[PDB]
From a paper:
SARS-CoV-2 utilizes a trimeric spike glycoprotein for attachment to the host cell receptor angiotensin-converting enzyme 2 (ACE2) and for the subsequent cell entry step which involves the fusion of host cell and viral membranes. Given its crucial role in the viral replicative cycle, the spike protein represents an important therapeutic target and is a critical antigen in host immune responses. All emerging variants contain defining mutations within their spike proteins, with multiple mutations clustering within the receptor-binding domain (RBD) impacting both ACE2 binding and antibody neutralization escape, while mutations within the highly antigenic loops in the N-terminal domain (NTD) across these variants reduce antibody neutralization. Given the rapidly changing mutational and antigenic landscape of the SARS-CoV-2 spike protein, a structural understanding of spike protein mutational effects and the discovery of broadly neutralizing epitopes is of importance.
We did not observe major differences in spike protein expression across the variants, and all mutant spikes tested demonstrated marginally enhanced ACE-2 binding potencies relative to wild-type. These complementary assays demonstrate that the totality of mutations within each variant S protein enable slightly enhanced ACE2 binding, suggesting a contributing factor for the increased infectivity observed for these SARS-CoV-2 variants. Superposition of local RBD-ACE2 complex models revealed no significant structural changes. These structural findings confirm that mutations outside of the RBD do not modulate the positioning of ACE2-contacting residues at the receptor interface via allosteric mechanisms.
Residue numbers in the entry:
A (entry chain A): 299 to 620, 641 to 675, 691 to 694
B (entry chain B): 14 to 69, 77 to 145, 153 to 176, 185 to 247, 257 to 298
C (entry chain B): 745 to 827, 856 to 892
D (entry chain B): 943 to 1041
E (entry chain C): 745 to 793
F (entry chain C): 992 to 1041
G (entry chain C): 398 to 446
Write the structure that this text describes.
């Protein structure tokens, strides 16, 4: 009070000195239930994969893509992500996901990268330099190799020019390496561009078949719908916490509500357009958001000539959220309540006055 | 497969009064016992709404503009209306939106469909006829959901396309009025929000033939156009919109 | 609750102190106004139990014993007919005490005329 | 409409509070009216400018509200002084003043 | 008549509404003042000829 | 530039409205005094000195 | 404060800049007062190998 009034002597009365706010304790981040997962079983766990010349492109949209299941798997040898980190994939959201699937050799996994050179990059599958996505590769000697030799995987060996990014070439036209016309027959200087892979189970690790799935993440001007799973913190009630419900954030006390929402409605507003009711996304229940108990702090004191005893009034704050006496004006600490009635000396409010005789209210 | 329908009867489309229909919930916010003023794409009160018939021989499938948004009303019995077509050129050059409701489920697909001149569904007297598109090459969005659906049923829909979001609002009303729109108020609940992100300037109504040539079942639909304007909505104690005021209709409502 | 906003707000000086001081002055002024209007007698006068005033009936303006609020029927009708850092301070005089002051004034002007306003 | 004067004062005070609360929703030329959105979306060199715009707009609104509150306080004080004069002269005595 | 100026002015909210309401209150207050000062009789009296 | 013009003109208009409100309060006080003189000096004889 | 940087990184020695040496090598405060001096030293601080 002395600091506020800029004086070493304080006269008798009540003086507004400070502001009391409740500090937030926890953060509650509730987003919708993690249902409707993206169909990753039909890409990674497919019984058969496509050839590298005719790589399968499955477009993934309108679902939740959980990348932690893929990242924490021990079955993948390569999980190299270009343009984005795997840790924030499970948080970020993308418009569409392109899942390209094919089989290559062990030594050819390095060529599935931006800026690389080889048969696969130039003639089979070309990645752009400004590529955002992840390249996942794993050994498939158990499934894609047979004792007789698995020749069910062809690659393009020759083309006149390099492929454009995300281009598929399934043409079976004879490559012309010489001046002479091929005339559609494979003779001299004219070769068929598609050649089969030899996959045996006794081959070395650089020749064993590797299944490669490349996920391409692009952002377009359309609203992004392939989002990651949104981790939900358990709900805590009756405390001043920071709530984040479906992207709507704030600070408040979340209590049970008797308001019956319609099924399509999520948030609640009063006359003054402030959010005072909300629907929990995980469990369909209605919660009232009461603002945290803020109030003025006033110091009731007599003159410093008489005494140095003081009392504090927390305006509009109940006594259980801070000689304790509950008044309509607020909680009064340091003044004893008496049942006798006297004339008003220091006005407190709501019919309550304070005086010095200790300080009585 | 495409089939030309050559047994139509020439007639101009009719017009009627909108009354106080076409109001939808502007947002997902619960409001109770309050009066809220909102500026959004709404259908004006007592406006001139175009009326189309399906009776036998009338089969109204014209080419209509979409503009900012479309209010679609349906006085329907026996389930003839099955879906809608949205797009710009309605061919394989651009990407178009398909909404259909067959005997099992509601299907939404965003593909470059090569549409027929007369897209339709069919009921044999079971559904065994579907002639809407001849091809579908590039598909970006698919969404399979539950079935949405004297004239006995009133279907109200509001189609809007803002910021790459297609908002479809729906309301189902039991009615017993024979020919026109009943006079009253019913706020349209939001049905679905789709992140299609495509340009839409034209739309088509999809109907179903009845075969026993072809016969058109008794149905009537109404097309109205949304304009940017302000409404004053009244929210009751239960959070349901019970009355509305068009801010620019007349000086009393103003 | 933004720390950066408060740090930028401190550059503008004592505007907040001025606004709080003005609001505090208004708040004390309202209580002073209520004291000036209603607290003009230092004796709480009461009416006699027998309401024999020579035919004059004051039931509509005297406090009703049946009502918990101890208000007159006219006062009860009057009370029935009137319907982000912001706080509302309660008035220093509550409604029952203001009603008590009006009751004291009514008892003084009925039993004593204008004598109580000028002395005993 | 018998009790219009008190209802008028209550309506004016409530309307002033509603306007003051409603002014928080205005961005005053900034990208957003929410401080958290600005702090989470922009770097501090430009967030300082956006917060400064919000601060000056809200401060102007609050000063305006305080100014009309003071004017209304003066009017209510004049009415209260008149009411005290009527209480002293009409209730506590008999007044010869006409009307 | 500048549309861009009005679009920028809409960012500042309801300042214009407050100013218009204050001026309207002053305007009705002047009529109330004249009514209180001069209209203190409900009978229009005339002097004898 | 338009924002600078808007804030300057808005400040001018707020200043004008504030001073008009103060003058309106003064005129209202004068009118209340005039009504009191109309009631007490014209419609009756006043014993109040001056 | 003396150092040697690239030719394109001289814009990052400034208050309120986003950059690489601004974040991990040398950061200036937003309320920085003073002068930044830069001059070419290809004749002295460069070798053919
Ligand atoms: C149904 O009728 C439409 C319109 O008459 C036909 O569309 C026309 O098809 C011819 C093909 O010879 C084109 O040359 C015209 O340009 C088309 N018209 C328009 C407006 O594009 C449609 O082909 C008919 N359906 C069938 C199956 O024949
Ligand atoms: C004074 O006035 C009151 C109210 O006007 C009288 O109370 C009424 O008494 C009659 C008959 O006893 C009842 O029918 C009314 O309902 C009463 N009115 C109310 C509001 O209670 C009262 O009788 C009058 N006289 C005295 C001596 O008190
Ligand atoms: C694919 O198979 C592996 C091996 O059993 C399994 O761990 C994994 O969960 C399956 N699904 C995906 C999406 O990888
Ligand atoms: C969300 O999932 C939990 C179990 O994880 C379930 O108890 C709850 O009912 C679900 N809520 C909704 C709205 O589906
Ligand atoms: C509706 O429009 C048609 C032609 O566009 C016109 O003939 C008719 O009178 C209009 N009806 C009303 C109610 O305006
Ligand atoms: C309805 O359409 C879906 C998707 O095209 C299809 O799977 C389903 O079998 C159809 N049902 C009928 C009855 O045709
Ligand atoms: C659309 O389809 C055609 C042929 O079906 C193809 O050539 C073209 O690249 C496709 N475009 C997109 C964007 O998928
Ligand atoms: C949408 O299509 C119309 C007509 O084809 C065209 O005028 C308009 O520019 C298009 N808008 C966009 C955003 O592509
Ligand atoms: C609101 O709902 C209650 C039951 O929850 C019902 O009694 C009341 O009639 C409803 N009010 C309206 C206007 O529908």
């Amino acid at each position: 009070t002395k600091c506020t009034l800029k004086s070493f002597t304080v006269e008798k009365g009540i003086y507004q000195t400070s502001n009391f706010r409740v500090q937030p304790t926890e953060s509650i981040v509730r987003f919708p239930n993690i249902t409707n997962l993206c169909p990753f079983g039909e890409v990674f766990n497919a019984t058969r994969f496509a050839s590298v010349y005719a790589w399968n492109r499955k477009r993934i949209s309108n679902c939740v893509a959980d990348y932690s299941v893929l990242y924490n798997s021990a079955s993948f040898s390569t999980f190299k992500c270009y343009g984005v980190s795997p840790t924030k994939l499970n948080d970020l959201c993308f418009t569409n996901v392109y899942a390209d699937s094919f089989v290559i050799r062990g030594d050819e996994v390095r060529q599935i990268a931006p800026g690389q050179t080889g048969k696969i990059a130039d003639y089979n599958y070309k990645l752009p330099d400004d590529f955002t996505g992840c390249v996942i590769a794993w050994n498939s000697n158990n499934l894609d190799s047979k004792v007789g030799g698995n020749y069910n995987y062809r690659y393009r060996l020759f083309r006149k020019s390099n492929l454009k990014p995300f281009e598929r070439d399934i043409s079976t036209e004879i490559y012309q390496a010489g001046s002479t016309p091929c005339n559609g027959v494979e003779g001299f200087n004219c070769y068929f561009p598609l050649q089969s892979y030899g996959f045996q189970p006794t081959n070395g690790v650089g020749y064993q078949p590797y299944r490669v799935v490349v996920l391409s993440f692009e952002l377009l001007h359309a609203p992004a719908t392939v989002c990651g799973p949104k981790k939900s913190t358990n709900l805590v009630k009756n405390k001043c916490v920071n709530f984040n419900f479906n992207g709507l954030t704030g600070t408040g006390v979340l209590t049970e509500s008797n308001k019956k929402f319609l099924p399509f409605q999520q948030f609640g507003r009063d006359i003054a357009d402030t959010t005072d009711a909300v629907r929990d996304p995980q469990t369909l229940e209605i919660l009232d958001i009461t603002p945290c108990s803020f109030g003025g702090v006033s110091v009731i004191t007599p003159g410093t000539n008489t005494s140095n005893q003081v009392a504090v009034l927390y305006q509009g704050v109940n006594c259980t959220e801070v000689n304790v006496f509950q008044t309509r004006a607020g909680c009064l600490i340091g003044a004893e309540h008496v049942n006798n009635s006297y004339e008003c000396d220091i006005p407190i409010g709501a019919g309550i006055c304070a005086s010095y005789q200790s300080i009585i209210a | 497969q495409c089939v030309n329908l050559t047994t139509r009867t020439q007639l101009p489309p009719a017009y009627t009064n909108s009354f106080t229909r076409g109001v939808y919930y502007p947002d997902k916010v619960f409001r109770s016992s309050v009066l809220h003023s909102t500026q959004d794409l709404f259908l004006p009160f007592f406006s001139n709404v175009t009326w189309f018939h399906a009776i036998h021989k009338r089969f109204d499938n014209p080419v209509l503009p979409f503009n900012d948004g479309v209010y679609f009303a349906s006085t329907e019995k026996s389930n003839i209306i099955r879906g809608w077509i949205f797009g710009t050129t309605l061919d394989s050059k651009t990407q178009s939106l398909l909404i259909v409701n067959n005997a099992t489920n509601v299907v939404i697909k965003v593909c470059e469909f090569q549409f027929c001149n007369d897209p339709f569904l069919g009921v044999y007297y079971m559904e065994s006829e579907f002639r809407v598109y001849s091809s579908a090459n590039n598909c970006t969005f698919e969404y399979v959901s539950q079935p949405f659906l004297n004239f006995k049923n009133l279907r109200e829909f509001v189609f809007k396309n803002i910021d790459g979001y297609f908002k479809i609002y729906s309301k189902h009303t039991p009615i017993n009025l024979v020919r026109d729109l009943p006079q009253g108020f019913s706020a349209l609940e939001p049905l679905v929000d789709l992140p299609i992100g495509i340009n839409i300037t034209r739309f088509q109504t999809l109907l179903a033939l009845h075969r026993s040539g072809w016969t058109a079942g008794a149905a009537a639909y109404y097309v109205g156009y949304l304009q940017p304007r302000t409404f004053l909505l009244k929210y009751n104690e239960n959070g349901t919109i019970t009355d509305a005021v068009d801010c620019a209709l007349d000086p009393l409502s103003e | 609750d933004s720390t950066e906003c408060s740090n930028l707000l401190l550059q503008y000086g004592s505007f907040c102190t001025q606004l709080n001081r003005a609001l505090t002055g208004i708040a004390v002024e309202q209580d002073k106004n209520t004291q000036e209007v209603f607290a003009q007698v230092k004796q709480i006068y009461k009416t006699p139990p027998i309401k024999d005033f020579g035919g004059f009936n004051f039931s509509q303006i005297l406090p009703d014993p049946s009502k918990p609020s101890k208000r007159s029927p006219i006062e009860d009708l009057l009370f029935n007919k009137v319907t982000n850092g912001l706080t509302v301070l309660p008035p220093l005089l509550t409604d029952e005490m203001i009603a008590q002051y009006t009751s004291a004034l009514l008892a003084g002007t009925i039993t004593s005329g204008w004598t109580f306003g000028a002395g005993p | 409409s018998a009790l219009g004067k008190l209802q008028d004062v209550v309506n004016q005070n409530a309307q002033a509070l509603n306007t003051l609360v409603k002014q928080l929703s205005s961005n005053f030329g900034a990208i957003s009216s929410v401080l958290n959105d600005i702090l989470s979306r922009l770097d501090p060199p430009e967030a300082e400018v956006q917060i400064d715009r919000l601060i000056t707009g809200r401060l102007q609104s609050l000063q305006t509200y305080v100014t009309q509150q003071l004017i209304r306080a003066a009017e209510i004080r004049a009415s209260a002084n008149l009411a005290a004069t009527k209480m002293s002269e009409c209730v506590l005595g008999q007044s010869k003043r006409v009307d």
